[PDB]
């Protein structure tokens, strides 16, 4: 039982791959939490921005990476592998554009990412990339879309989601929230995401501890909200 968890290509006695689950758990090593909420006409994601050192450069720590002007990603988990996967995703989007013209839909983009991860998991050559890849982006004819697609190679469509240490609690909070059908507006979506993160983390959420990125139908370009916009959204949330 426990002797089958040293190689990624060896099946456990009950029909399990232990290394993939181990990478899933490693996702939490960063100690961060990220949440995505898909509004009626917007997609908003908020992730913790931990800077436990005065000498760090807060501008170079942001975890929100822009794969493309129309598609967005937030890497949660191991930093190096997350950045490697973000670079691979940028390459995949560029190649899709170069070979087929139209911008690769987010679902396809990290479906390719997840296929790469799965091919990694099948052939025992490289340790699976221990970093959850949350994608957002407005898609014509399908409204806002947020897709989480992970080391083992599973990608699904999400109305709301989260990856990180506090994933179960955040998803339970979203389920409690996502059910009371209501106007999913830009401001409402950002407020719900920030509220879910605050309750899960139980933190006052100072403006310098969070980083937000929103894609909207009106402006279908990934935008990273500055400190002022985040603070205004927080003050609106409080009152």
């Amino acid at each position: 039982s426990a002797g089958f968890d040293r190689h990624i290509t060896i099946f456990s006695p009950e029909g399990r791959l232990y290394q993939v689950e181990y990478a899933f758990k490693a996702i939490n090593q960063g100690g961060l939490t990220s949440v995505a909420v898909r509004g009626k006409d917007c997609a908003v994601i908020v992730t913790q921005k931990k800077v436990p050192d005065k000498l760090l450069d807060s501008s170079t720590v942001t975890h929100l990476f822009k794969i493309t002007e129309n598609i967005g990603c937030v890497m949660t988990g191991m930093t190096a592998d997350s950045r490697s996967q973000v670079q691979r995703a940028r390459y995949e989007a560029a190649n899709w554009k170069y070979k087929y013209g139209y911008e690769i839909p987010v679902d396809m983009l990290c479906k390719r990412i997840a296929d790469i991860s799965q091919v990694y998991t099948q052939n025992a050559e490289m340790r699976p990339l221990g970093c959850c890849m949350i994608l957002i982006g407005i898609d014509e004819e399908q409204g806002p879309q947020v897709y989480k697609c992970d080391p083992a190679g599973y990608y699904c469509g999400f109305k709301a989601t989260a990856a990180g240490v506090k994933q179960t609690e955040s998803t339970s909070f979203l389920e409690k929230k996502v059910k009371k059908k209501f106007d999913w507006t830009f401001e409402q979506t950002v407020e719900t995401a920030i509220t879910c993160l605050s309750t899960v983390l139980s933190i006052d959420f100072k403006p310098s501890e969070i980083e937000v990125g929103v894609v909207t139908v009106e402006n279908p370009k990934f935008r990273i909200l500055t400190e002022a916009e985040i603070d205004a959204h927080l003050v609106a949330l409080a009152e």
């Binding site: 009950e14 029909g15 897709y147 999400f158 709301a160 989601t161 389920e175």
Partner: protein
Amino acid sequence: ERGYSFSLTTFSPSGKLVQIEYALAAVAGGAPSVGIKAANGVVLATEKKQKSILYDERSVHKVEPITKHIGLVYSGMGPDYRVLVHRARKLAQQYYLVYQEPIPTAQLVQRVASVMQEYTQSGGVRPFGVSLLICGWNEGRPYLFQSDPSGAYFAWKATAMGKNYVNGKTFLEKRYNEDLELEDAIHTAILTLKESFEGQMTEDNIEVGICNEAGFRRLTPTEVKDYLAAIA
């Protein structure tokens, strides 16, 4: 014989490829799937439950088309299913290009089985942890085959794979008659999913596909709702 339950390229003393059996167990530990072959067409049904209401049920489809007249439903590891379906589509289109005729269900199933077996012959490559169930209508005769990680393929008339497959097989051989029609086959498949289905069978939780002479098509939530209401 715990010493030989590790490598796929070594023979156990009794002569069992242990890793293939373990992969088959992993397949049987997946999501349910049942398919029935009717004299008029074929029916494929899988239970599509997401762990929470936060998952877009329409983003990932367990039943996917390989060509205009071939289908695919699985029971096991979905990420492996994605590569399996990609290989199946490539094989079907290669056959079409070389022969300019839609690949017959038998040949596509055989080539998919060969692809599966390709991974069960060298150390460092994990056997495909998913058993595919292929629909089809070639030469005016409905087809249903199951390709396993071991590479073997059969011609199942009607079977259920994944969790609670024993109960599904027992239900079959009871409500299955060799002279049914597509609607009755759909009803039997829905019932078979029901007897191994936990919770309410919503339109977004059960995905079905008819694969008759007209071709393979994934029933939209509307038709599934109508069928379930008729059965319910």
